[PDB]
Design a protein around this ligand. Sequence first.
Ligand SMILES: *[C@@H]1O[C@H](CO)[C@@H](O[C@@H]2O[C@H](CO)[C@@H](O[C@@H]3O[C@H](CO)[C@@H](O)[C@H](O)[C@@H]3O)[C@H](O)[C@H]2NC(C)=O)[C@H](O)[C@H]1NC(C)=O
Ligand SMILES: *[C@@H]1O[C@H](CO)[C@@H](O[C@@H]2O[C@H](CO)[C@@H](O[C@@H]3O[C@H](CO)[C@@H](O)[C@H](O)[C@@H]3O)[C@H](O)[C@H]2NC(C)=O)[C@H](O)[C@H]1NC(C)=O
Ligand SMILES: [Cu+2]
Ligand SMILES: [Cu+2]
Ligand SMILES: [Cu+2]
Ligand SMILES: [Cu+2]
Ligand code: NA
Length: 499
Amino acid sequence: AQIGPVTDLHITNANISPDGFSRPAVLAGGTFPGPTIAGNTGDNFQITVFNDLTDPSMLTDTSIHWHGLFQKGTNWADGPAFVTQCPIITGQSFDYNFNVPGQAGTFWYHSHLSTQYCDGLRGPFVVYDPNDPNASLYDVDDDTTIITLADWYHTLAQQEPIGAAITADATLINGLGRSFTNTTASPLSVITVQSGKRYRMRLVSISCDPNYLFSIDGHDMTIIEVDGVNSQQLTVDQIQIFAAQRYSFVLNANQPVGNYWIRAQPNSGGQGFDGGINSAILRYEGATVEDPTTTAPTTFSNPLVETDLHPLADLGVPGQPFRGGADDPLVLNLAFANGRFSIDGVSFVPPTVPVLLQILSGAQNAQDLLPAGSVISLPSNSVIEVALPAGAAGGPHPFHLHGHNFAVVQSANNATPNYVNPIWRDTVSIGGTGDNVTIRFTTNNPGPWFLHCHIDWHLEAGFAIVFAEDIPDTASANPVPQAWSDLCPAYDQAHNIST
Ligand SMILES: *[C@@H]1O[C@H](CO)[C@@H](O[C@@H]2O[C@H](CO)[C@@H](O[C@@H]3O[C@H](CO)[C@@H](O)[C@H](O)[C@@H]3O)[C@H](O)[C@H]2NC(C)=O)[C@H](O)[C@H]1NC(C)=O
Ligand SMILES: *[C@@H]1O[C@H](CO)[C@@H](O[C@@H]2O[C@H](CO)[C@@H](O[C@@H]3O[C@H](CO)[C@@H](O)[C@H](O)[C@@H]3O)[C@H](O)[C@H]2NC(C)=O)[C@H](O)[C@H]1NC(C)=O
Ligand SMILES: [Cu+2]
Ligand SMILES: [Cu+2]
Ligand SMILES: [Cu+2]
Ligand SMILES: [Cu+2]
Ligand code: NA
């Protein structure tokens, strides 16, 4: 069952064995992935998060981010630790009370403390649209049509060396999959369809690192949504999905009744499908209960290419049709050396006082804010352009901006910008050496918004900056509840920190 929009959510430690290997984890709602949180567009969500964690090896504090939800007027509820709040301590709870005006689509929630979401705190978050303009393109859209893709590690996250190339031990599809080494024939996930029906499959990357080549043998996929943004219909036979991205696609159950492999090949870790790694099963009602016998093609003839995507609505592009054609045109210098990432010469290390609390306490320019050199102010009601030229080790890096979606003016592997009709999204691969992936948005949401690579090991190694958007209006725009004001005193008392 789905939960929400008003619900409790308990965060616990438990043993799980999603690939046959038992390890302890950090779980929401007692499962991996966590339960789907759902509501309708414009609803009030009140997710009262109970921190019941006791195992220090995965951290007993927590904080949860609602990925892709704009949090306009509720920056305090966004979740990134030491940007918008201090962590919730064990034995305490916190009501994330916010609204989702003007958004409808496929989202997710995850821990936003250290690398804790890798240890299991990740689940789907769906905002349905009762008047969806795509409603007539499918018959079925429910909890059974959500497909999560996850990396899973046998080593606990707090034992992963900072700045290292860290590699997973299994791909999990809907929480199940097989280990790349010491492979055992543990259970695979089954997605069941009825011959002749059309399904809105909501594909969610809950990855901490790898991108996946996703396909379904015998079937093609008609994309209708990208990171919450409705798209024109685009039919593909493979989707390369980067960490934290989402797609909705129409699956037409138009092939003979039978069993078909669902494939998710990561860019690192186990390659291929031996022993049923990187796999799940599409089963038609009436098919025999047995593994598929289907083959992938040697090459995919209609893969997703990001420049093929276009919004369903006439979203356009803000600013002027050339590089630098914005009120505030930025170019970030994105680098890696010696185990640490940097942005504009500064490696991100979380501050003691959350950025939002520094601003509410009166610090009002970005050079007054900590960490020094890690906060860039943005002017209000302005067109912002951010060029993100690739080349830093560990690519391709999927960059994500909190508080906003953005026009993808230039995509990976293509030097031509699009100032007319590019897709809008919230997480974008910056590509490879010599690329110049560039995003645009307008500043209509006061508050500090994190910008970072969504490979969680890279964020931990410093690949982040904070956009302090409209500092002067942050306090008036974002009134804070007493329970939020109580978080830093409680956290600092529990941890013997002076501030
Ligand atoms: C990605 O696109 C951005 C624009 O969106 C390019 O930025 C441009 O970068 C050049 C230098 O590479 C800038 O010109 C330089 O400016 C300094 C003065 O600030 C000057 O001292 C240098 O001699 C040179 O003129 C330019 O300001 C900047 N913005 C523009 C043109 O709008 C960036 O180079 C592109 N990166 C890649 C890898 O393609
Ligand atoms: C590399 O990225 C560029 C920019 O996104 C892509 O260029 C765009 O290509 C599309 C598809 O061909 C062009 O749209 C077409 O326009 C013609 C003429 O109006 C129209 O008859 C078709 O209905 C379609 O809309 C679009 O103009 C063009 N944009 C620009 C700025 O060049 C390009 O396709 C990408 N390269 C690859 C290999 O995918
Ligand atoms: Cu996220
Ligand atoms: Cu986010
Ligand atoms: Cu990265
Ligand atoms: Cu984030
Ligand atoms: Na425009």
